[PDB]
Amino acid sequence: KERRFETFSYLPPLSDRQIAAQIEYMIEQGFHPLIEFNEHSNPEEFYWTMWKLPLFDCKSPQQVLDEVRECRSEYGDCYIRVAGFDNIKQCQTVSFIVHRP
Amino acid sequence: KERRFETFSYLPPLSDRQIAAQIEYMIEQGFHPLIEFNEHSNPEEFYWTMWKLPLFDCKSPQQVLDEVRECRSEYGDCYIRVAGFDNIKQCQTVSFIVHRP
Amino acid sequence: KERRFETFSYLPPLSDRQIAAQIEYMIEQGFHPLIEFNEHSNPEEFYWTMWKLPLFDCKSPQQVLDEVRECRSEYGDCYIRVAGFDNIKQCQTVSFIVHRP
Amino acid sequence: YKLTYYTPDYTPKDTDLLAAFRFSPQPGVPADEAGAAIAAESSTGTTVWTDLLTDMDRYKGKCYHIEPVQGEENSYFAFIAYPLDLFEEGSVTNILTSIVGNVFGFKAIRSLRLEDIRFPVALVKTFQGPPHGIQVERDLLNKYGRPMLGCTIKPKLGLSAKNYGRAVYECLRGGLDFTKDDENINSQPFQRWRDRFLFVADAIHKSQAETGEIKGHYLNVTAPTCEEMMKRAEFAKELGMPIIMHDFLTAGFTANTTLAKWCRDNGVLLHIHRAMHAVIDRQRNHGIHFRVLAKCLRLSGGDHLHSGTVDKASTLGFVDLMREDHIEADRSRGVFFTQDWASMPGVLPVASGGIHVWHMPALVEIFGDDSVLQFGGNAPGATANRVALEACVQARNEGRDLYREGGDILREAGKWSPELAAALDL
Amino acid sequence: YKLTYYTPDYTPKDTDLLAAFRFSPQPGVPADEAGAAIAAESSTGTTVWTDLLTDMDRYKGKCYHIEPVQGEENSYFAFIAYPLDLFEEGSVTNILTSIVGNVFGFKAIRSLRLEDIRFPVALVKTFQGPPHGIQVERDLLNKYGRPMLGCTIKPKLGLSAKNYGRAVYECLRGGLDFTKDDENINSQPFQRWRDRFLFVADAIHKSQAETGEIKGHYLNVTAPTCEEMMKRAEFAKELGMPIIMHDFLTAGFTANTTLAKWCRDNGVLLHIHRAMHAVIDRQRNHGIHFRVLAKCLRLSGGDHLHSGTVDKASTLGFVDLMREDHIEADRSRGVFFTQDWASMPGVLPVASGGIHVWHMPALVEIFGDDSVLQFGGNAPGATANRVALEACVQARNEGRDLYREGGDILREAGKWSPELAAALDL
Amino acid sequence: YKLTYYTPDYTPKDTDLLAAFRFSPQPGVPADEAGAAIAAESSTGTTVWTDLLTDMDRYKGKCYHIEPVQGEENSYFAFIAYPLDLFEEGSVTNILTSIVGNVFGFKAIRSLRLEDIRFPVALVKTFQGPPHGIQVERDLLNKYGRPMLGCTIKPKLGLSAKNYGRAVYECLRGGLDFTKDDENINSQPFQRWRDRFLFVADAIHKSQAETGEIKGHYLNVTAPTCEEMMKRAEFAKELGMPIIMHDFLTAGFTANTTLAKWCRDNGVLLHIHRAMHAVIDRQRNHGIHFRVLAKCLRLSGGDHLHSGTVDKASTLGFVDLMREDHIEADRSRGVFFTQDWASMPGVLPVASGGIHVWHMPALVEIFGDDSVLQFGGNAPGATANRVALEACVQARNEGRDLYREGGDILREAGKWSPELAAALDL
Amino acid sequence: YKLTYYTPDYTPKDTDLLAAFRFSPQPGVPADEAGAAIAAESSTGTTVWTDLLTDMDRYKGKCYHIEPVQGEENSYFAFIAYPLDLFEEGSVTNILTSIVGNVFGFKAIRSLRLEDIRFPVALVKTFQGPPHGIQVERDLLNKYGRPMLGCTIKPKLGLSAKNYGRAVYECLRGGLDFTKDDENINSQPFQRWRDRFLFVADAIHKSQAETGEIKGHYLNVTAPTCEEMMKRAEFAKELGMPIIMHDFLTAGFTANTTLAKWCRDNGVLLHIHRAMHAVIDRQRNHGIHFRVLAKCLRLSGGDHLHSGTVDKASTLGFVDLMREDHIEADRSRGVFFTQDWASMPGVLPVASGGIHVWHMPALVEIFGDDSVLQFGGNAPGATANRVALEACVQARNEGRDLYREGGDILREAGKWSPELAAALDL
Incomplete structure (x- = not known):
């Protein structure tokens, strides 16, 4: 009804151009995108199901977009979240929704 | 959706030939089959409803199959599990699903 | 009757020559003698009454002997103990009786 | 000599x-x-x-x-x-x-x-250091990529516990992560501490259920005695409260270290308010600079520390001192010595003092994601603050300069957001 | 506004x-x-x-x-x-x-x-106020008619626990009522707190047995945490120690109030040291005057409070504020408001800072009997201090003016006292 | 003599x-x-x-x-x-x-x-013996007919508590029964033990809900002191964790017996890691053979015991010594004496060290159902391991010889299982 | 790699x-x-x-x-x-x-x-390090200037608690500082631990009253569980026992650290026996050298540590490692790294194994005053050992070379001492 998601869910649903810009920022900072999906979205539920691997050898924002599209075609009624990790600073620096059922 | 059952549920659904082979192994080891059924399958729920007696005087794998078929015809929307006990070693040595709703 | 004192009390009462040799060793190691006296000698009683100062500017074993003689002439019915401290190692390295009532 | x-x-x-x-x-x-x-x-x-x-x-x-x-x-x-x-x-x-x-x-x-x-x-x-630190705190609250948003309930005194919880619920359902007790609020006759804790916990549970995001309220456990402080912290833990607040200067460092140890043992975040800091740090010629107190608080224990509104360079220096593991000596930033923290977790700076949603781009640029922005007042206002914050973060990630384009970014976000449009109109 | x-x-x-x-x-x-x-x-x-x-x-x-x-x-x-x-x-x-x-x-x-x-x-x-107050403290220590005498053990750091107890015993057998831990002494590697407490308790028991007068040593229980502080206070009570010391500003008022409640419940006197007071009170234009902190300490709880060496009139004012039940407003003495204490017991002022036995008449006149004179160093020196103190009190009672006859009184006392004669020679 | x-x-x-x-x-x-x-x-x-x-x-x-x-x-x-x-x-x-x-x-x-x-x-x-033993453990986990599967999380050091829980969840949802702490993981600065316990408990609950099978993670409670160890075991029990891990040689037998008694009293399984065993057992001419340590551990208490990778006959002998109630003396298997256990429950052997899914038939044949197979790394890999294990068990029950037909069995199972097909391709 | x-x-x-x-x-x-x-x-x-x-x-x-x-x-x-x-x-x-x-x-x-x-x-x-360390231990026992003397009660097994106390009393009244439990003695059927503690405490009190010197007996608190160990340590404290013993390798480092913390909190000295050390350290090509275990024990906590009978140079090296604050790297003495202890107190080495009163000069020269000489048997024999020890110390202080004049020193002392004369006759 009025449920939210932690980052960028108070903005309009991100377009593929905006998602690509976010992934491009992630690539510049060296955050390798991790794609996760879930059938619900509960604040107390920390973990989502990861989409088949973290993309360590990613050179283009478009590849992450293709992985998101494939997960959409597999989990159309699932949320999709993009995560990124600063392994040097050992902090997860990115977590935002890119798909809602 | 992706629910599992403890033994052989990562294999394809056992055929009557494979179930008969399992029961035959049980008979050689002296494990008298115990048929149990339940309307759900929860990991925390230890006990299922037993199908009318353990077959102590079983001479053929086919009779256990007939009991499973009869429980299927009575509880078609219930899971069916075959259990076996090594009473000398006092350990349940067998527990596998033979029917899903 | 058979009461003892911690160091050298199983040896015969130390003579002034032996006391001077002990004080001479004390001076070489840099342990400045501290003279203390007590009217009793109880194992649980840690502290004795100090004889008027520790001799920091002592150049001769004979001066410590003179201080012990003076305390004897003042506390003839008191025990007299010579203490020494290794201030670098922060450990009391010497404690032995030189006079008994 | x-x-x-x-x-x-x-x-x-x-x-x-x-x-x-x-x-x-x-x-x-x-x-x-x-x-x-x-x-x-x-x-x-x-x-x-x-x-x-x-x-x-x-x-x-x-x-x-x-x-x-x-x-x-x-x-x-x-x-x-x-x-x-x-x-x-x-x-x-x-x-x-x-x-x-x-x-x-x-x-x-x-x-x-x-x-x-x-x-x-x-x-x-x-x-021990901070009970959890920046990284673990973000993991526990499931909040990433942006500074946290807080609001201090107003008025400071007079609200009953139930109306206090009402105000907390409105602000939290609006889109803020944290609300907070005023530092003056301990257990006054108009609002006893246990009633306030009960009603605030109810408000937090309601706002969490409605929004689907983890919510918190810094319950002040500053107490006359050690025993009262432990009772208040214990009741906060009983209610499932994720964060508590402590005034480390007026209560003292002994009580603060005790509370930080308890917070580590019980999985509770510890927000640190710096009441009475200006008695010590304000005069440039006398006292103790706040950076020393911030280092002592990082040692004693605290997950958040109030760090002023924003000399800019010295505040940047002590924010580095409280966040980073290794800080090089830099006199322009007031860092006289190189400080190594030996993997002791960092402390989240909390910037407060009426931070003025048009100033959001500057704050996001200055502090970065690892900070709390505390607003000195209802659900639409909270929503406007949250929208402006996420728009600033989105623009910063896209490469746009927050200092130069901040007003433009806020204008762009306000076209599709009525609450932000009203806030910008004001 | x-x-x-x-x-x-x-x-x-x-x-x-x-x-x-x-x-x-x-x-x-x-x-x-x-x-x-x-x-x-x-x-x-x-x-x-x-x-x-x-x-x-x-x-x-x-x-x-x-x-x-x-x-x-x-x-x-x-x-x-x-x-x-x-x-x-x-x-x-x-x-x-x-x-x-x-x-x-x-x-x-x-x-x-x-x-x-x-x-x-x-x-x-x-x-609660002071755990016992001036009157009850004098009753508990059986000391009447004169200020109490204290000595802070020197050097501040380096002494082992056993040698620390040795120094305490020498000073106490000399004729002093109290010895005290330095404020820096808590539980350092060269001297762990439990060893120090044990050896000091032994020294106190020996000096009490020898002199026949109640002796005390302010054992510092200032600790990193509430639990360590309670352990140290508990061990002091176990040893029969009459008095403990707390640094109320650096440890904080929460810990101090907790400790004062414990001291009242366990019959232990509480000496309060004012470390870090000059950070707050020294500048005449900024901060909090120490008289406010003294009032807050009387409320929070303390049987002694360090009150400086001795503007004279302002110190007299806040000594009245900490001792008397009713203090009239007096701007010359820095008393801005009339303060009523409603029979809350008073706090003993502690005058310290190398108080210079020739200054004993002036201190006795300024502070009167209800005070502690703390000397910033052996048995003859302690005896000289005690002799000078009792001579000053005797002369004051006889009617002689301590300000004008103090040197004469000290000379008269030193004619029959060799330790005081040597001290006056110095 | x-x-x-x-x-x-x-x-x-x-x-x-x-x-x-x-x-x-x-x-x-x-x-x-x-x-x-x-x-x-x-x-x-x-x-x-x-x-x-x-x-x-x-x-x-x-x-x-x-x-x-x-x-x-x-x-x-x-x-x-x-x-x-x-x-x-x-x-x-x-x-x-x-x-x-x-x-x-x-x-x-x-x-x-x-x-x-x-x-x-x-x-x-x-x-006491094992807190629960093989039979009761199978009853508590509702796992029958096959060896249990475990995976040790990699890398040993560096993962935050949240990412640690992520890895645990992936492995457990893949189809493994157990994940485990590395023996080096106790409470390091990068990952404090309580955070790790919290996040691992969350991962276990999620994987259990998704798969419908009981899941576990051996939370390491090896601690510097007895009190810290009890705190960690207590928190594991508070979270509903079914199993904990202890390093019995480096922590010692006193702590291990204490923990086993607690595990029996609180219904928690106890996995025993044998760190430092090679210091004692590796040289054939000096020290203590591991079978003696295994017997001492069965007495002291443990539900699992790491028993090496797999001389084969001696390992079979000490697996009998830890599982059976009566073991006949057999010098070819290293059993020097006949051992009677008087119905003391047996200990589950844990075979680890990169056990190489193509080696699954040999392990299933050697150890039988009453064992844990520990894999030294994601959900498809866990699924491949589980599929290979169940195929080997199914083939063994059908009468086929695992030693001779193991590769054929794995090939047959891989035709209908893509994860196992990829694993066999590797 | x-x-x-x-x-x-x-x-x-x-x-x-x-x-x-x-x-x-x-x-x-x-x-x-x-x-x-x-x-x-x-x-x-x-x-x-x-x-x-x-x-x-x-x-x-x-x-x-x-x-x-x-x-x-x-x-x-x-x-x-x-x-x-x-x-x-x-x-x-x-x-x-x-x-x-x-x-x-x-x-x-x-x-x-x-x-x-x-x-x-x-x-x-x-x-924490040692509960008290060498210096504080000498202060607590009031023993200075000479190594301490100990005797292990014989036979190891069979003595009832009362006869055990009899043997302890004879040895302690003879002139020894310490007697000790055998490492095998915990709570066997012939001698339950509480009876042994009671009777040994009585023997210690009697010998202390008779000799006027502080006496001790290392009561073994090594127990099957943490709780039994705490009970035994607690009862030893209840009886006023100054020292207890623990086997740190067989009980383990977790229990040892727990016990050392308790010993520091309760003012009890902790003697550490090294049973099972030869399983680890004896082979020059495999295992852990005992110097590493000695360093780990100094960290974990222990006031005494058994250090062998006396390669001489390596034993001197690890005695330095356990006593000194700073030890330079010296390969001839087996010190591979420079070790700084940062004022952590040292551990007393305990030399044992039938140390043969004619070997007393060599032991006094090798170990110096900061050591315990443990004799592997009645009051005259204890007196002879004590006389020889004090004669060796007196001769060393006088400048005479113990290596060359040791037999001469012993003869000179035995001329006026009948017990030492008989011991030298043997």
Whole structure:
């Protein structure tokens, strides 16, 4: 009804151009995108199901977009979240929704 | 959706030939089959409803199959599990699903 | 009757020559003698009454002997103990009786 | 003094505690004499018979560097090294009592200000540090990529516990992560602490259920006694509250260290308010700079620390001191010594004081994601603050310059958001 | 502000808390505007929807008097009344957080100093006060007619626990009532606290047996945490120690109130050291005057309080504030408000800082019998101090003027006392 | 020695403790003299007046058999019987201190290795044994008919608690029964133990909900002190964790017995890791064979015990020793004595060390169903491991020979399973 | 491995933990490859997806030096540095599990022996260390200037508690400072621990009253469980016992650290027996040298440590390692690294094993005053031992050479002492 998601869910649903810009920022900072999906979205539920691997050898924002599209075609009624990790600073620096059922 | 059952549920659904082979192994080891059924399958729920007696005087794998078929015809929307006990070693040595709703 | 004192009390009462040799060793190691006296000698009683100062500017074993003689002439019915401290190692390295009532 | 406590050729050991003092000697007193005096008054004080039962040199604070302050007259920096053995392990109270316990009353100094302390790694390892730290806190709250948003409930006094919870619920359902008790709110007759905790917990549960995001309220557990403080922290834990607040200066460092240990043992975040800080830090010529207190709080324990509104460079320096693991000495940023934290977790800075949604781009640029932005008042206003924050973060990630495009970014976000449009209209 | 927070015709109620602020406004700001600002920043801060769910006027701090400081320019006294309802009962921490929590950072004030607080009787009754007080302490120690004598063990650092006990025993057998831990001594590697407590207890028992007078040593229980502090206080009680010491500013008021409650419950006297006081009180233009801290300590709990060496008149004023039940307002002595203590027991002032046996007549005259004279070093020196003290008391009782005859009294006493003769020779 | 401690005609009593020592005497020393020396040095040591206040013979360890080692020179087996009265009941620590406490330093022996201990039934009954044992553990986890599957999280160090829980969740949802802490993971600065426990519990709950099978993670409760260990075990119980892990050699047998008693009282399974075992057991000529340590662990308490990767016959022997109730003496399998366990529950062997899914048929054949197969890494890999395991069990039950048909069985299962097909491709 | 774990140009940081390994590679394996393998197997083990969620390099053990062993073939020393972050603070168990947990089973190494560990100061400060240390122990027992004398009661088993106390009383009244439980004596059926504690306490009180010197008996509190151990330590404290004994290897380091913390909190000395040390340390080519265990025990906590009978130079080295604050690297004495203890108190070495009163001069010369001489038997024999000890100390202080004049000194002392004359006659 009025449920939210932690980052960028108070903005309009991100377009593929905006998602690509976010992934491009992630690539510049060296955050390798991790794609996760879930059938619900509960604040107390920390973990989502990861989409088949973290993309360590990613050179283009478009590849992450293709992985998101494939997960959409597999989990159309699932949320999709993009995560990124600063392994040097050992902090997860990115977590935002890119798909809602 | 992706629910599992403890033994052989990562294999394809056992055929009557494979179930008969399992029961035959049980008979050689002296494990008298115990048929149990339940309307759900929860990991925390230890006990299922037993199908009318353990077959102590079983001479053929086919009779256990007939009991499973009869429980299927009575509880078609219930899971069916075959259990076996090594009473000398006092350990349940067998527990596998033979029917899903 | 058979009461003892911690160091050298199983040896015969130390003579002034032996006391001077002990004080001479004390001076070489840099342990400045501290003279203390007590009217009793109880194992649980840690502290004795100090004889008027520790001799920091002592150049001769004979001066410590003179201080012990003076305390004897003042506390003839008191025990007299010579203490020494290794201030670098922060450990009391010497404690032995030189006079008994 | 100068013959024994001034050691210009001494090189500090990695195990030494270093203190940077800014001092003005009284007329007549030479600067080096005053610096040796600062070293002596903070280590040994100044003959008695017991002196020669000890090693005097070993427990001596040494002034190893004195330099005049650039662009000022009768002002100097004194750098003093103290042996690791002077201090009780894991005790901020003992370190403060040793360093700043008596030296500030010394008559031969006109003005004295402790600018910085270098805590050696061997000393740092004896402290717990923050109960959870920045990284673990973000994991526990499931909040990533943006600064957290907070609001202090107004008015400070007068609200009943139920109406207090009402205000908390409105702000939290609006889109804020945190609401907070005012520092004056402990257990007054108009609002007893247990009622406030109960009603705030109810408001938090409702807002969490509605929004689907983890919510928190800094319940003030500052109490007259240790036992009352433990009771309040315990009740907050009983209600499932994720975060509590403590005033570390007025309650004291002993109570704060106790509470931080309890917070680590019970999985509760600890927000630290700095009431009475201006009594100590405001005068540039006297007292203790807040960066020293921030370091002492990182040692004592705290997951958040109020760090002012935003000299900008010095605030950036002490935000680095509280967040980073290794901070290089940088005098332009007020970092007198290189500080190593030996993987002790960092503390989240909290920027507050009416931070003015049009100032959101500047705050996001200055502090980055690892901070809390505290707003000094209803659900649409909270939503406008949240929308502006996420728009600023989105624009920063896209490469746009928040300093130059901030008003443009806010205008762009306000076209599709009515609450932000109204807030920008104001 | 001035329209709502400045009330020149308001008469304070007997239940109000009054604060006297000395302030300098920044150039441009009128004095009355600054005074109303001090009243607002220390009560309410400054509109939101929750405001009209409350009674704004009822929780408002009112500036009821402003006057310029005599003989100074751009300086004023602001008198502010606060309702009794603002404060949690029995909490010094809450009172300090309310009054001086934020006002000292206000930008429109150049300099601010809290001079005095009038605690209403209704608030005073919610505090325990000193664990025992002057009268009960004299009864417990069986010491009457003269000030108590104390000595701080030297050197501050380096002595092992056994040698520490040796020094304590020498000083106590000499004729002193108290010895004391240095404030830096908590539990350092060279001297662990439990060993020090054990050996000091042994020294106290020996000196008591030898002299036949009750002896004490202020064992420092200032600890990193509440639990360690309780363990140290508990072990001191286990050893039969009559008095312990606490650093109330560096440890904090929460821990101090906890410890004072424990001291009352366990029959232990509580000596209070004021480490870090000069960080707050030294500058005449900024901070909190020590008399406010002394009043807060009398409320929080303490049987002794370090009160400086000896402006003389202001020290006399705050010694009255800590000893007497009713103190009239007297600006020459720094007493801005009439303070009633409602039979709360008084606190013993402790005068220290190398008090120089030739200065004994002046100290005895200034402080009277209800004080502790702390000497900043062996049995003959302790005996000389005790002989001089008793000679001064005897001469004062006989009618002789200590100020004019003090040297003569000391000479007369030293004619029959060799230790005092040597001390006077020095 | 040989006259009193060598008793070749003595028949051990059923209440005696027997020890099998493999020894090499130093050149010159005859073998029987060395064997009597081993018996003496491990029972009595060697005259004093107190000797005749005792019965010397009654507490004497008797060497009752010496035989040379087949195919070796200067090597012998010494069999020593010890009375039941030498040992404190229920104490593995005391038994080890008595048997191997001093004898290994005896100079006249070149090399000594304790091969086996026969624990008499009367001694066995004084120990709790495993908290639950194999049968009860299978009942509690509802897992039957197949070995359990485990995975150790990689990398050993560096993962934050949240990412650690992520890895655990991926492996557990893949189809594994257990994940496990690395033995190095206790409470390091990068990952504090309580955060790790919290996040792992969340991962376990999620994977259990998704799969519908009971999941577990061996939370390491190995701690610096007894109190920290109890706190960690208590928090694991609070989270509903079914199993914890303990390093029994580095933490010690006292802590392990304490923890096993707690595990029995609180319904928690106890996984035992054997860190530092190779310091003791690796050299065939010196130390203690691991089978003795396994017996001591079965007595002290443990539901799982790491038992190596897989001489095959000796590992089969000590797996029998830890699982069966009655084990016949069998020198080819390293079982020197017949061991009766008097219905003390067995311990689950844990086979680890990169067990290589193509090696699954051999492991299933060697260990049977009552074991844990620990994989030294994501959900498809876990699924492939689980599919291969269940295919091997199904084939074994059908009568097919796992040694000869294992590759064929894996190929057959891989045709309908893509994850297993990829794993076999690798 | 060699490309990543072998860093010949790396200089260790002062915060690093260093380990010196003596290894023999298996034929074929080059030495540098084996050294990098030792570094890897003791830090990280060896790719998985979780690897890139971490900083691999930061938690990596680096082999920074390899050198061949002088006068040996196929033998090398590997020096490995480990970051301070690998280890839980204050945990000997974690350090041992990290360093020697798995590396000793590595197949490519034929033989491995851990020779030395350099504990960084930052790690050392996280441990309590000895409960009291050498200096405080001498103060508590009022024993100065000479080594302490101990005797182990014989026979090891069979004595009832009352006769045990009889033997203790005879030895203590003879002139010994300490008697001790045998390590096998815990709570056997012939002598229950509480009876033994009661009767030994009575014997100690009687001997103390008779001699006027503080007496002690190391009551063994080694127990099957943590709770039994605490009960036994508690009862020893209840009886006023000054010292207890613990077997740290068989009971384990967790229990030992717990007990040392309790001993510090309750003022009880802790004697540490090293049962089972020869299982680990005896073979020069395998295991852990005892000096590493001695350092780990100094960290974990112990006031005494059994240190063997007396290669002489290596024993002198590890006695320095356990006594001194700073020990320089010295390969002739087996000190591979410079060790700083940061004022952590030292541990008293205990020399035992039938030390043969004619060997008293050599022991006094070798160990000096800071040691315990433990005799492996009645009042005259104890008196002879004490007389010989004090004569040796007196002669050493007078300047006479104990090595050359020892027999002459003993003869001179025995001329006036009948007990020593008889002992010398034997």
